[PDB]
Swiss-Prot record:
Gene assigned in the entry: BACE1
Residues annotated as domain Peptidase A1: 62-344
Enzyme active site: 224
Record organism: Homo sapiens
Membrane topology of the entry: Single-pass type I membrane protein
Protein name: Beta-secretase 1
Lineage, opening ranks: Eukaryota, Metazoa, Chordata, Craniata, Vertebrata
Family the entry assigns: Belongs to the peptidase A1 family.
């Protein structure tokens, strides 16, 4: 938890958060997307219309070819590459250098984003979902094994021609107490592959969705910084929109809005936040029958793009995804050592005069264990 790591993240709305890193010798500078939703460290290693610079292996005296191809398909978008290792540093991170696995991207499809300003991706999740297989040690594992950095990192993602710029902090090796107020509440990491958690209850403006909690985690629920929106399984999505639509029936928007396709604008400064409800996601606590909740304001699920916004909540077919817009306003601790994820109100907390994002507990909930999907 260093003051030198504060504000070491940057990016544009809808295009994620990236941290500056150097690879090879001499140091090659690159902006790398911080993604707790995957486990491969990869960087553009060949020219591309959206890349202004890229990893040039031939210019690195410390590069070692692993002579193995690698391929990684995401929800939408994918890339192909060549494996190898090299020295990697995070200028605004811990003062150490480690030899890490790196997937030099040679071919890609709908992966890189035009104008995003990042040239690679840092999969911070576990080896289990790493490609080719789990023998390809993820970056953070190498960092912990090679240096004395504590097996833990925390993220503070903040809100907002060109798309609004965003800032944040990735504290490697610790917790920076000045980045949050109040208490930290932890939810167990159900399994060490994605950063899987369990949602046991959901409320829209204080009203219970009243669904079997297995639906909330239908398939799985993950904390994913590499994903923008709050993604919800079909049944949960529909209940959610119906509830949100009702609360804001005072005004009407085109179906494209709710489908997160087309934006919606209001006179600059007149956004009627008060008509949109708050969303409370209750997460399993560290104790049976006990949980805590994180409340999201409309300022979070209505992403800036007159003041224009897009509905940052969309239907998923691969489970719940607590994306960036959910993480924003909260200080999130990925306590790998103790297999848990802590949440707390962020210093750049979720605004508003009558309301505010919050992290509250405890709230008793029985049989939280049957909320998960049992393989
Ligand atoms: C951060 C910049 C914002 C980009 C806006 S986004 O549309 O929300 C990105 C999201 N896209 C969507 O969620 C999406 C996209 C289109 C339609 N519906 C949903 C997505 O796929 N995210 C990848 C990171 C990524 C970032 C990019 F910038 C471009 C890519 F290519 C990939 C996560 O790693 C996925 N974790 C779940 C997961 C799923 C499958 C396999 C794995 C094993 C690696 C893992």
């Amino acid at each position: 938890s260093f003051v030198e790591m504060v504000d070491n993240l940057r990016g544009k709305s809808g295009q994620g958060y990236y941290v500056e890193m150097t690879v090879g010798s001499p140091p090659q500078t690159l902006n790398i997307l911080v993604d707790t939703g995957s486990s491969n460290f990869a960087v553009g290693a060949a020219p591309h219309p959206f890349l202004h610079r890229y990893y040039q292996r031939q210019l690195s005296s410390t590069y070692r070819d692993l002579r193995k191809g690698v391929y990684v398909p995401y929800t939408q978008g994918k890339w192909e590459g060549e494996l190898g290792t090299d020295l990697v540093s995070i200028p605004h991170g811990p003062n150490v250098t480690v030899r890490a696995n790196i997937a030099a991207i040679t071919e890609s499809d709908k992966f890189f984003i035009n104008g995003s300003n990042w040239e690679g991706i840092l999969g911070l999740a576990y080896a289990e979902i790493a490609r080719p297989d789990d023998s390809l040690e993820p970056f953070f594992d190498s960092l912990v094994k090679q240096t004395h950095v504590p097996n833990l990192f925390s993220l503070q993602l903040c809100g907002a021609e060109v798309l609004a710029s965003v800032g944040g902090s990735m504290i490697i090796g610790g917790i920076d107490h000045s980045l949050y107020t109040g208490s930290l509440w932890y939810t167990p990491i159900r399994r060490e592959w994605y950063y899987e958690v369990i949602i046991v209850r959901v409320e829209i403006n204080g009203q219970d969705l009243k669904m079997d909690c297995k639906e909330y985690n239908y398939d799985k629920s993950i904390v994913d910084s590499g994903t923008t929106n709050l993604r919800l399984p079909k049944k949960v999505f529909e209940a959610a929109v119906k509830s949100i639509k009702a609360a804001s029936s005072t005004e009407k928007f085109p179906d494209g809005f709710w489908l997160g396709e087309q934006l919606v604008c209001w006179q600059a400064g007149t956004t009627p936040w008060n008509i949109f409800p708050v969303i409370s996601l209750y997460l399993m606590g560290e104790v049976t029958n006990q949980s805590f909740r994180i409340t999201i304001l409309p300022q979070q699920y209505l992403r800036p793009v007159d003041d224009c916004y897009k509905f940052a909540i969309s239907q998923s077919s691969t489970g719940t995804v607590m994306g960036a817009v959910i993480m924003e306003g909260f200080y999130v601790v990925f306590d790998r050592a103790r297999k848990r994820i802590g949440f707390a109100v962020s210093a750049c907390h979720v605004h508003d005069e009558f309301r505010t994002a919050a992290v509250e507990g405890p709230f008793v909930t029985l049989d939280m264990e049957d909320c998960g999907y049992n393989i």
